[PDB]
Structure formats: C-alpha cells, structure tokens
Design a protein around this ligand. Structure first.
Ligand code: NAD
Ligand code: SWL
Length: 259
C-alpha cells in the first residue's frame, strides 16, 4: 500500500537501473512516468513494458534533465497526465571525465533541480500529500576513485545534498522523505564507458585499475538494485538514509558519527 496506486517519476528510465526500478514499481502497483533523453531507447522500453503491464500505467517523456525548462515541463506533464506525484527517483547519470563539467550538470545539478521540483509538487506546504524522493549516488559517493575524480565529486555532492535536504524536510514539515542509494558495480552500459577515451580523457591509461576492482568485488544485475529501492519506499521511518548495495556486504546503511 506504500506503492500501490502511487505515481512515480523515474529519470534515466529507458535502460539499466532506471528500467529495473520502473519494472519493480509497476509490479508493486505504481503508475510510472519514464523520463529519459534517449528517445529511441525510451520507445523500445515503453513498448516492452506495454506488453507486460497495462499501457495506461506508463508514460514516456523525452527530457534532458540538465535542461531546467525541459525538466520543469516534464514534471508539469507528469502531474497533468496522472494527476499527482508521489515518488521521485533521480536516477539519470553519466560517466565522463573528459567533458567533466557536463557530468556535474547531469549527475549533480539535475538531481538538485529535480529534487526541488519534486518538493514543489509534493510538499504539504505547497498543497501536496507528501512523498518520497530517492537520489541515485554510488559507492563513489562515499569512497574515492583515482580514475573518476569528477564522477566521485558529483556522487559525493548527492550524498551531502540528500542528507541535508532530508533534515530540511523535517523542519519544513513537508511530509517528504529523501534518501539515496549507493550501489557498487552494476551490469549496465555505464560499465562500458570506462573503455572509452571519449569518456575517460586523461584517465584512460589507468582504466585497468577499475577493471581489477570489478574483478575484485563483482557486479550486481539491475533487478537486485530495485529490491533496495522498494525497501526505501515501503519503510516510512527512512529519511536521510544512505543505502549501500554491494555483493560483498549486501544492503546496508552508511553509519555516521554526527554530533
Ligand atoms: N552501473 C554502475 O556500476 C553504477 C554504480 C553506481 C551508480 N550508478 C548510477 O546509476 C544511475 C543509472 O545508471 P546505469 O548504470 O543504469 O547506466 P545507463 O547508462 O545504462 O542508464 C543511464 C540512463 O540515464 C539516461 N540519461 C543520461 N543522461 C541523461 C540526461 N541528461 N537526461 C535524461 N536522461 C539521461 C541515459 O539515457 C540512460 O538511459 C546513474 O546515476 C549512475 O551514475 C551506476
Ligand atoms: C563507469 C563506472 C561506473 C561505476 S562507479 O559508480 C563505481 S561502483 C564501485 N563499487 C565499488 C565497490 N567496492 C566494494 C564493493 S563494490 C568500488 C568502486 C571503485 C572503483 N575504484 C575504486 C578505488 N573504488 C572504490 C566503484 C566505482 N567506481
């Protein structure tokens, strides 16, 4: 009943972890707006979901989340079409240390923009019913990566932002909980980007160190990450939680020594 009948918006939903989230949420009874900048992947994804689940339970919107006008229009569309917003998953992201400025815009700036749009629609102080926002970070949000310093920067920023916005929500009595998920390696297109100079820039020569870490720890499949998302949504005690998901230690929250 925490998911059933709710409306979710998932960015980066065309493939990888985003699609896995959409499938898990549809199975739990949600309506899902799939939001992605890749029109062709998006159409393929919705067409496949339309075979499994009911067509009216999904909407596909093409949107570059880093474009604030497109993002604002996307939100408006979702709420017009489904009549409310209950669950926001800021999941879109890239790996690109060469055009690292753009990586920050997609990975960090867009998570903040999306979060604040979600709060605009969902906060009880703005006429909403409350809700949950889940931001995708990474284990790279908690630990350093020599070959991906700007990705690391962006994923650390998501952690700081989400912990902070969760405390602000309590203060503002918005009735919105904000949590983040920090997966280890997951079997998606993004893993392939480490092979590419276009993505790695000056770090390409050291790509094998990442490969050795992959070998060391192993790779999750997207559907296992989705279980984690469902836990966050179902447990309404969870606010400001940083959920780690790895093969080595499972599903565990980050502990912090706060004052
Ligand atoms: N796969 C991993 O090992 C791993 C580990 C930890 C965190 N993550 C994070 O998980 C999230 C999902 O990535 P994934 O591994 O499923 O990769 P993926 O590349 O398969 O999926 C990312 C999706 O986001 C979309 N997207 C990218 N930039 C966009 C933008 N500007 N606007 C709209 N959509 C955009 C892409 O088109 C794609 O469909 C990302 O935030 C990524 O950083 C991945
Ligand atoms: C294209 C790269 C996308 C994957 S990143 O988000 C990512 S996920 C990940 N997971 C882990 C895990 N540690 C324990 C269990 S799984 C480690 C890394 C990583 C890679 N290189 C280092 C030093 N680290 C910490 C990384 C890392 N760089």
């Amino acid at each position: 009943s925490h998911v059933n009948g709710k409306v979710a918006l998932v960015t980066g939903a065309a493939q990888g972890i985003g699609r896995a989230f959409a499938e898990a949420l549809l199975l739990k009874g949600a309506k899902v707006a799939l939001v992605d900048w890749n029109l062709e992947a998006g159409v393929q994804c919705k067409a496949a979901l339309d075979e499994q689940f009911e067509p009216q339970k999904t909407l596909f919107i093409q949107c570059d989340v880093a474009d604030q006008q497109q993002l604002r229009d996307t939100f408006r569309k979702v709420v017009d079409h489904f009549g409310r917003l209950d669950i926001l998953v800021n999941n879109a992201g890239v790996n690109n240390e060469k055009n690292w400025e753009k990586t920050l815009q997609i990975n960090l700036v867009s998570v903040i923009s999306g979060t604040y749009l979600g709060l605009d629609y969902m906060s009880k102080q703005n006429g909403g019913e409350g809700g949950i926002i889940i931001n995708m970070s990474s284990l790279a949000g908690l630990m350093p990566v020599a070959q991906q310093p700007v990705y690391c920067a962006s994923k650390h920023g998501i952690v700081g932002f989400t912990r902070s916005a969760a405390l602000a929500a309590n203060l503002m009595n918005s009735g919105v909980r904000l949590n983040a998920i920090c997966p280890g390696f997951v079997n998606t297109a993004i893993l392939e980007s480490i092979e590419k100079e276009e993505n790695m820039g000056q770090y390409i020569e050291y790509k094998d160190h990442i490969k050795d870490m992959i070998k060391y720890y192993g790779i999750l499949d997207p559907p296992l990450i989705a279980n984690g998302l469902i836990t966050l949504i179902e447990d309404d005690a969870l606010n400001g939680a940083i959920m780690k998901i790895t093969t080595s230690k499972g599903i565990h929250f980050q502990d912090y020594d706060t004052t």
